[PDB]
Amino acid sequence: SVFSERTEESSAVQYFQFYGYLSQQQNMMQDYVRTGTYQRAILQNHTDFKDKIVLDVGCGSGILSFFAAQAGARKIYAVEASTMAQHAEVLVKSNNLTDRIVVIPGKVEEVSLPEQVDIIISEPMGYMLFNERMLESYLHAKKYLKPSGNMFPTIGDVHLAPFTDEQLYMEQFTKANFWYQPSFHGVDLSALRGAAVDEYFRQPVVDTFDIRILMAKSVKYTVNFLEAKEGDLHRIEIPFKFHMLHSGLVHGLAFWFDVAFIGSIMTVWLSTAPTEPLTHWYQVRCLFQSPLFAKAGDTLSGTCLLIANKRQSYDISIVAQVDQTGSKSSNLLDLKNPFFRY
Amino acid sequence: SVFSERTEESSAVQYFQFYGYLSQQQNMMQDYVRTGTYQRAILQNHTDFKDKIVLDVGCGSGILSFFAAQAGARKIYAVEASTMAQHAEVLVKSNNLTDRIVVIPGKVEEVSLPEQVDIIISEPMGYMLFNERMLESYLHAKKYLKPSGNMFPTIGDVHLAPFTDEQLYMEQFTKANFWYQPSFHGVDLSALRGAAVDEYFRQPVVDTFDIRILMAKSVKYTVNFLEAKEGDLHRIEIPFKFHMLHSGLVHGLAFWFDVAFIGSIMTVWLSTAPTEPLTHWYQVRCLFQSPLFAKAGDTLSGTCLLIANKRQSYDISIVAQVDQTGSKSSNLLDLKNPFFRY
Ligand SMILES: N=C(N)NCCCCCN(CC[C@H](N)C(=O)O)C[C@H]1O[C@@H](n2cnc3c(N)ncnc32)[C@H](O)[C@@H]1O
Ligand SMILES: N=C(N)NCCCCCN(CC[C@H](N)C(=O)O)C[C@H]1O[C@@H](n2cnc3c(N)ncnc32)[C@H](O)[C@@H]1O
């Protein structure tokens, strides 16, 4: 299938095993910003669901399908590849919604549905939006979408901004500097110091931070899920040009994302911005190996390039330069090995 | 090979990927009890190494091979299956030991060595001693050991003891009671509460604890690595009869381990007991489904059975009874999915 071809089997096994646990579902459900915002998006846009046919891609415990049912959906096909499908079916029966929610076990790339749908709902966002490559499954599922069907979420905005955080930078350097020792119990480790530095700086940092570390306004990169094709997410090129509002050392780029549910009644936003209440996505920072000095009024330009890999993640290439001086930093990150600093 | 036959490929891939990271090597190296005790065992037993041929099973960064070299080994074959083998080779060259340490990339069950060895060194201990099933690779490697060759570590003692920890026990139901809610955003979750409870009780708890929770002296189960065969570790039956030193509710069994390096000059011990400084192995606790009341002077008897599985771990079956009352409890736990409580 399209899934098996893009995904190493060992990655897939671990991925679906992880989502089989009720404790993982509980952690996500307890994010009230997440769960309450999805419910609001769906219920306040009840006319997008009333008497409609719905596909829930990767339904987990089924929560979004229950919201679609609360909003009056006629039929909801709830697709789920992990063993969580079993638990979803238990809830459908115990909530007396067997006439409206049909659990379909399997990958959305592999199952057969009996009809086309009016609207697709999912929660395909990982860290930095793109981690886990579930957006591809979501876009793949548009093979079931009627012409002029809707997608909830409809669009995703990735925000990037330069930050300064000397303490974060030094933390990672301090860890890597372990490998500088010429006599660790009599052993010279120093030949590996470069490799150690590279490894640590390849880890995106997942946590939150004070917005005062940001040195310019964010650049926004928008993916429209009604228009995007699955293949568009194999290679994602994000150019940026920041007008620096503060002078200082730029230690990296910070990332967050917003999704919008563009319904017939209203647009509801779920934001993971550092100006908004914290969610379980936090925010993500990619450190530069060497910071770049810029003055207020300078321009920091470059590219963030995300290349999808077979471990359901992305290799991230970030190249940035201060236009006025030619000072450049170039860095490679492995979005599958984040450092959870919170 | 013997490895591939006992190990699912997806488990192996994840396992060796994990050990490929320098940050994981650093975490282990920074455990001073671990690293200092290995160095002491080797250096203080220098006659077991001087001008000897050594095999280092699963050498990682190579640190134990460097200690063997410090002690005067003539030739050290250092086997390692992860990409850490590359980093080990870099250290062998930068420490000017290419005449003495030969890094052999691959599984010890699959590579060829050119000669028999005088002594095998390894660090094959996981959580509860047996997790990761690396002891089997260690025992497998005795095909290369000369008659009367030594093994460092030489023996391993697993300790089990009954504990009382009312708060730990109650925490399982508190977490599972998330599901015991008739209207979570309008959805009745209650039918999943039993499945949630079962899931949490299947997870052994990795953390440390105050020794005052222990209700009896530990029972010790000893594996002699000079005598044990690989096959002895497929099913590990640990009968126990605890003479209760305190009266109270027994919520489960706590586990830790010691290994001894029985050298010609001295025996050096590495302990992970809760009476000793904390190591990166912590300790492990397995809950009973129901607590058992016992009085000081009673006997708590039963069996801990560890059955090796193809995810490089064990299914743990614990059955226990208070002999004087006939009160019985059981649990089945999955050592591959521990709860890291810290
Ligand atoms: N970054 C952190 N921490 N969290 C990110 C949160 C994202 C979780 C999204 N979703 C749960 C959303 C659902 N609405 C609910 O309420 O659980 C995950 C579920 O989708 C399933 N799945 C993934 N791919 C496919 C596919 N190709 N075919 C069929 N099923 C698929 C997973 O098996 C998992 O069950
Ligand atoms: N508590 C947790 N999680 N672990 C406890 C610590 C475990 C020890 C870590 N290390 C040894 C340390 C080394 N002496 C050092 O000094 O670095 C294990 C290494 O054995 C290797 N390996 C495993 N199997 C095989 C096999 N069949 N063939 C070849 N190599 C094998 C691992 O690839 C890993 O590199």
Residue numbers in the entry:
A (entry chain C), B (entry chain A): 135 to 476
According to the publication:
Protein arginine methyltransferases (PRMTs, E.C. 2.1.1.125) catalyse the transfer of methyl groups from S-adenosylmethionine (SAM) to arginine residues of target proteins, giving a pattern of nitrogen methylations dictated by enzyme type. Co-activator associated arginine methyltransferase (CARM1, or PRMT4) targets substrates that contain proline-rich sequences rather, than the GGRGG sequences favoured by PRMT1. Co-activation of gene transcription is effected by methylation of histone arginines: H4R3 by PRMT1; or H3R17 and H3R26 by CARM1, for example. Novel non-peptidic bisubstrate inhibitors and crystal structures of their complexes with CARM1 are reported here.
The catalytic core of CARM1 was crystallised in the presence of amine-guanidine inhibitors 4, 5, 6 and 7, and the structures solved by molecular replacement. Electron density corresponding to each of these respective inhibitors was clearly observed in the active site. In comparison with the position of H3 Arg-17 (the arginine targeted for CARM1 methylation), the guanidinium groups of all inhibitors reach beyond Glu-257 (which forms a bidentate interaction with the substrate arginine η nitrogens) and Glu-266 (that forms a hydrogen bond to the ε nitrogen of substrate arginines). The B factors of the guanidinium groups of 4, 5 and 6 and 7 are relatively high compared with the other ligand atoms, which may suggest that this group retains some flexibility when bound in the active site. In contrast with previous results, a weak interaction of the 5C amino acid-guanidine 7 with both PRMT1 and CARM1 was detected, exhibiting IC50 and Kd values of 20–40 µM. Binding of 7 to CARM1 is also evidenced by the clear electron density in a co-crystal structure.
